[PDB]
Amino acid sequence: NNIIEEFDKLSDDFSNDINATKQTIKDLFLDIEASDDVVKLLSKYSFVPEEKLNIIDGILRSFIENNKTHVINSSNAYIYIQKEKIKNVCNFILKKLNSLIQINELNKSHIILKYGKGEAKKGVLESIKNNDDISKNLKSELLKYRVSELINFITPIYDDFIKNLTDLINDLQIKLKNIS
C-alpha cells in the first residue's frame, strides 16, 4: 500500500534531479550570455534543452504511474526488483546527463573564449590555464584567444547537444520497455 508511495517517491526524486540538471544547463546558457543581439538568439537556443528534459521527466513519471497496476497483484520479489530496475534506469539517465553537462561546460568555455570578451567573464582563461583535465594541445589552441560567424561556430556544437539529448530520450524509452 505504501509501495505506491515509494514509487511516487521514485517519480518525485527523478523530477527533482531533472530540475536541478535543467537549472545547471540554464546556468550554462546564462553564463554564455555575458555577453544584445546574440543574447536573444542564445536565449532562444536555451528553450529546446529544457523541453528535452521535461520529456525525460514526464516519460519516467508516466511509466511509473502505468506500472502501479502491475505492482498491486504481483509477488514482493517483482515489486522490489522492479523498483530496483527503475532506480537503475534513472541513475543511468542522470549519469549520461552529467557527462553531457561536462562536455558542454568545456563547449561553453570554448564559446566565451572564441567570441565573447568579458573580460571578467573571460576570466575563463585562468580556469583553462589551471585545467589539468584537458590536453595541452587544446590548451595551446585555446590560450591564443561577426554574427553569421557565431552561428557558423555554435551550430554544430548546439546541434550535437540536442542530438545527444534526443538519443538519450530514445535510450530511456528502450530501457523502460525492457522492464515494461
Residue numbers in the entry: 48 to 82, 88 to 197, 206 to 240
Paper text:
Two proteins from P. berghei, a rodent-infecting parasite, have been identified to be essential for host cell traversal by sporozoites. These are PbSPECT1 and PbSPECT2 (sporozoite microneme protein essential for cell traversal). No pore formation or host cell membrane wounding is seen in the absence of either of these proteins. In contrast to PbSPECT2, PbSPECT1 (∼25 kDa) has no detectable primary sequence homology to proteins of known structure or function.
A construct encoding PbSPECT1 residues 42–241, called PbSPECT1Δ41, was then expressed in E. coli and purified. Crystals of PbSPECT1Δ41 diffracted to 2.7 Å resolution, and its structure was determined by a combination of isomorphous replacement and multi-wavelength anomalous dispersion. The structure of PbSPECT1Δ41 revealed that it forms a four α-helix bundle with a ‘hook’-like feature at one end. In contrast to this pattern, the helices in PbSPECT1Δ41 are nearly parallel or antiparallel to one another; the angles between the helices range between 1–8° from parallel/antiparallel. Two PbSPECT1Δ41 molecules came together in a “V”-shaped arrangement, with a total of ∼1260 Å2 being buried at the interface. The asymmetric unit is constituted by two of these “V”-shaped, presumptive dimers that are then related by noncrystallographic translational symmetry. The segment leading from the “hook” to the α4 helix appears also to be flexible, as electron density for this region (residues 198–205) was visible in only one of the four PbSPECT1Δ41 molecules in the asymmetric unit; this electron density was sufficient for modeling only the main chain. In contrast, a striking and spacious cavity occurs in the interior of the structure proximal to the “hook”. The volume of this cavity is ∼750 Å3, but in actuality may be just somewhat smaller as six residues in the α1-α2 loop, which is at the top of the cavity, were not modeled. This cavity is lined predominantly by hydrophobic residues (L75, F76, I79, A81, S82, D89, V90, V91, L94, Y97, N156, K160, I163, I164, Y167, G168, K169, V207, L210, I214, I217, Y218, F221), with most of these being conserved in PbSPECT1 homologs. Of further note, this cavity is juxtaposed against an unusually deep pocket (145 Å2 in area) on the surface of PbSPECT1Δ41.
